[PDB]
């Protein structure tokens, strides 16, 4: 019964219809990341940014968007390992939650939540955020230049993990991209499941998430039957 820590990146939701928030391209939905994902871009033109996420939140809840095979396998993995499992995601979508996972740590926030520019308090939110809402309100999404959420619990799980699995994460966004090193530093067996290479991993597989993830999860679960 190994302790397992899984870190997921935008890639896993790609097959579900949620266009990967590129960064090497610098364009997220035809928008500059510095313009829609930095505290500066916001203060500069809040209306536009608000509109940008309103559109992201909207699309997130459309019929054609649902968890894929990779999300589901991760729910099966949690079902099996219970308290020895921890899922950390850099994603702001709720596909892991819809698949069946619980206690998912959203280090970069959640698209279906918001917070007030003054108190910071958080409250659920599924619709659009209009110029007429207050405790002012902004997306509960960690922008570049801001501090990730749950870092204390994440770092604790990393020091405790027997197996650290990084799924479809681009070795480009830190601190998340540095987790593999931490895990490896504490003796964990590191695994990388990605569409493509570019990511200290002892075991690695490449190909569509909905194919690679379920396969690895099955191998692992069977392996410790």
């Amino acid at each position: 019964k190994p302790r397992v820590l899984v870190l997921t990146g935008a890639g896993i939701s790609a097959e579900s219809g949620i266009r990967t928030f590129r960064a090497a391209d610098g364009l997220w939905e035809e928008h500059r990341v510095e313009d829609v994902a930095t505290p500066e871009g916001f203060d500069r033109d809040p209306e536009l940014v608000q509109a940008f996420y309103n559109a992201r939140r909207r699309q997130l809840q459309q019929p054609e968007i649902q968890p894929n095979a990779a999300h589901l396998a991760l729910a099966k993995l949690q079902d099996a390992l219970g308290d020895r499992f921890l899922l950390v995601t850099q994603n702001i979508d709720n596909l892991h939650e819809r698949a069946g996972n619980t206690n998912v740590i959203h280090m970069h926030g959640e698209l279906l939540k918001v917070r007030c520019s003054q108190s910071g308090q958080v409250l659920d939110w599924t619709g659009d955020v209009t110029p007429e809402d207050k405790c002012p309100l902004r997306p509960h999404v960690v922008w570049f230049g801001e501090m990730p959420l749950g870092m204390d619990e994440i770092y604790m799980a990393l020091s405790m993990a027997d197996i650290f699995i990084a799924i479809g994460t681009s070795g480009h966004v830190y601190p998340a991209a540095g987790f593999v090193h931490e895990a490896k530093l504490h003796g964990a067996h590191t695994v990388e499941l990605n569409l493509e290479p570019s990511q200290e991993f002892a075991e690695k597989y490449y190909g569509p998430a909905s194919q690679v993830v379920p396969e690895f999860v099955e191998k692992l679960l069977k392996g410790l039957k």
């Binding site: 960064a23 990341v33 570049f144 230049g145 830190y174 540095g178």
Partner: peptide, 8 residues
């Protein structure tokens, strides 16, 4: 620990 969200 870890620092702010950032891109290499």
């Amino acid at each position: 620990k870890g620092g702010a969200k950032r891109h290499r």
